[PDB]
Design a protein around this ligand. Structure first.
Ligand SMILES: [Se]
Ligand SMILES: [Se]
Lengths: 300, 300
């Protein structure tokens, strides 16, 4: 037993990371089949980032201006396309190590594993949630740009994220693998408001169930509540509204534990109104919202 | 910037995981060069685990009684040795995928990455600390036995841990790769006291420095203290004694931040005596002790 924040094994992805250099800027690329994907701001200098005209800047670039290095293996670039905020560099060799893969655009509240890389070299793996306001709170130093987020189902890597920006607030923003930003963000070094974040209510509930399974039951109380009562409390406390879709997804966990969802909500309400009072749930002294129902089920 | 609990990329290790079956018991093995390492209790039934005589049980086994499966590749076992609580199964093929590697026995307070596996298949990666009482708090379901813990330096995998037991308390215990348990534990399903755990003081301090670097400074106070004053407070609060070795290892972090170690200790003291008062450090509402000075430096 036991419960941990756990990333997917990164092996399949490590074999796809490349280094992409254009002019003076180095960052990470993702080589699948014969296409290398990377943040289009690889083409920018420091000053460029203040106010880039990506079309005009890219027009000053040809195929030979992109250095693609796979470990020590130089890749030959034979086409280049901008799609939203990604570059798609066509190279002459299919990646021998390409796994089965999909590109997916995930939803707020969903989670994924990040392989943080520098100079096309993996350095660490960890699990992130896409926040309701479409930021992530990661660990992304200078040159992490181009690191990707992914899920694995059996043999298939669903790439869902590529890192592009740290906001002045210190949170992180980026694209799907088609180059469309999550959230209102743009690939320019400018003031950008993320906007109010909220707790992923359904994740918190899933985590409470994981706590019950693991033997932490102190917070289980004598009350119940209704979706609407609970949702009123959710409002006050800056939590996402709970819907029937959410109740449904907790079904299997409510099934195992014999604790109906709305009884778990009344527990949550007591925690939101009374706090945790110096106690811990699954070793945490706040309410974790970084685990989906799927995450919890996988681990149980 | 940003700060996260981060495991090593698991790629190098995923290519070493095998499935080991003997009689009715399946668990995980580690295939390096021509030797497969696994928990010796693979040879035990359920009832065996109550009171195993490993010599006598192993004497009833030959090379062909060990099923070693590497994905779909059956391995041929040609010798078998018990070393402490591990079996070393000699197989006829060197693992093509063997990385550079060391076996190391780590120290309490040190951290490592766990590749949790089931039936020789990796399912997730996450970072653990070896507790002062030589347990780990992991996520290890039925059949996780044989999963390993490791560090990576450049190209070299230092294996430090193999999973063997969940204690009745729900914490985890296991061996180095020579088969010597961390802590007082044995590979028998019996009552086993772990004994008092304590907070890894130096880790907490490293984490406080990581917090300063990331912009969290609320807890920085007007006081200082001495090693002995601090250590008296450490005692009261079940924290490990801070030594000069520890001060030394925080040197580089004290260097960058311009906050002397003992000033960071006075801050810690105020936190230990006054609590966190509903505030958060690096998104945590308690004091994290799961990051070493090396971990923090790597991430900064
Ligand atoms: Se970037
Ligand atoms: Se086991």
């Amino acid at each position: 037993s036991g419960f941990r924040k756990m990333a997917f094994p990164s092996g399949k992805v490590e074999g796809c990371m490349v280094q992409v250099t254009c002019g003076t800027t180095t960052l990470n690329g993702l080589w699948l089949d014969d296409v290398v994907y990377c943040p289009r701001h690889v083409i920018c200098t420091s000053e460029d980032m203040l106010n880039p005209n990506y079309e005009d800047l890219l027009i000053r670039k040809s195929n030979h201006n992109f250095l693609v290095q796979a470990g020590n293996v130089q890749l030959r670039v034979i086409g280049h396309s901008m799609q939203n905020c990604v570059l798609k560099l066509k190279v002459d060799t299919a990646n021998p190590k390409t796994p089965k893969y999909k590109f997916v655009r995930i939803q707020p509240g969903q989670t994924f594993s990040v392989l943080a890389c520098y100079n096309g070299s993996p350095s660490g793996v960890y699990q992130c949630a896409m926040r309701p306001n479409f930021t992530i709170k990661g660990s992304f130093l200078n040159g992490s740009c181009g690191s990707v987020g992914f899920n694995i189902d059996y043999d298939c890597v669903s790439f869902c994220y590529m890192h592009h920006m740290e906001l002045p607030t210190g949170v992180h923003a980026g694209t799907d693998l088609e180059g469309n930003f999550y959230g209102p963000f743009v690939d320019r070094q400018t003031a950008q408001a993320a906007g109010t974040d909220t707790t992923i209510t359904v994740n918190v509930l899933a985590w409470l169930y994981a706590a019950v399974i693991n033997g932490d039951r102190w917070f289980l109380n004598r009350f119940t509540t209704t979706l609407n009562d609970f949702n009123l409390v959710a409002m006050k406390y800056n939590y996402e509204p709970l819907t029937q879709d959410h109740v449904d997804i907790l079904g299997p966990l409510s099934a195992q534990t014999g604790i109906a969802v709305l009884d778990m909500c009344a527990s949550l309400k007591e925690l939101l109104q009374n706090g945790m009072n110096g106690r811990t749930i699954l070793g945490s002294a706040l309410l974790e919202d970084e685990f989906t129902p799927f995450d919890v089920v996988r681990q149980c």
